[PDB]
Amino acid sequence: DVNTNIVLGGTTAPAVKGDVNVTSNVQAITSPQTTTIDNQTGAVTYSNWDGKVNGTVTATYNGQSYTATLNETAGKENSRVTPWYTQDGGKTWNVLKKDGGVYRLEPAGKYQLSVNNVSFNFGTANANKKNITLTSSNGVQFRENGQWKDSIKVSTDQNGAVSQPLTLLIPITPVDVT
Amino acid sequence: DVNTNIVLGGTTAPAVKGDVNVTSNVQAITSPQTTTIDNQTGAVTYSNWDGKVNGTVTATYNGQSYTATLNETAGKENSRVTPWYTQDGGKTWNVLKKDGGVYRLEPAGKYQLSVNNVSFNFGTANANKKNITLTSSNGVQFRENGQWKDSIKVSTDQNGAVSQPLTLLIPITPVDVT
């Protein structure tokens, strides 16, 4: 697209993009293990939260919908799901240790999932392709050059698989019981 | 190497060995950035600690002393030094984050350093050797099969270098400098 338009930003490249439309279908759910109250009022208190999270990452590309592949082997190359939280406004981000042997995912609060060694099999139909550009539909980020990024370029190998392993950051906002 | 002696606790191989004897020469030192005082008692109070660590890992092998090599490359290959603390003790172990942009280490101690992609150059003289036993003389541990241990077996390549990257855990107990 020709750049015609005089935006005060200083004539940057356009935001027109997207070969592969990566979309998290990851969902998070939590329940309190212990609810308390003072009977002097009706002031309930839900506490001791117990989080769980499930789903997958799909990707629309050339009118076909693919699903991300994880690695179920036990080496350094295990696609390790690691939950991240911020006490700040995302100024920093710390890994959740297991407390009482569960992931305390407290309702609202902001979370992020990190999963390395992801892939996709786009099929022999899509072999040997260069500059496939991955964009997120819903706040998924891709790791590159030591830093998170809104989009990344991948090439497919002779079979149609992304030639090198990805690493994703997935947003999480739990639902709760009640 | 022959079992004569009836110890309680089954009978098991001896622990004595060490083809190559690794020693941490890592030292840690800290100062409070603010020293304060309760004049009604005269009880001083140190706070805002500022830790620094320095040193090397050496190793004795076949009468010669070698020194560990780190990897400088910007990337996934980089020997990442990560400071490491246990809250109270044992099962707890978490990454030490920078506060006030510096690594506060309190002289009460209980810290460990973790460093990947280490190596050694044992010299052309020690090429092509097949199974070498690594031991520490001062509490350095080596990573394998997802867990630390005090010994590992490695082989040298055509040049005399450890064929594969090591990953170490180094103890440190800081000292207070006035």
Author numbering:
A (entry chain A), B (entry chain B): 32 to 209
The authors write:
S-layer proteins (SLPs) are self-assembling, crystalline proteins coating the cell surfaces of many prokaryotes.
The arrangement and architecture of SlpA_ac and SlpA_amy are highly similar. The N-terminal part, exhibiting the first two domains (SlpA_I and SlpA_II), is known to be responsible for the self-assembly of the S-layer protein into a regular lattice. A second interaction was observed within this crystal structure, a symmetrical homodimer interaction spanning from Asn92 to Asn176. The self-assembly region (SA) is formed by domains SlpA_I and SlpA_II, building a 2D crystalline network that forms the exposed surface of the SlpA layer.
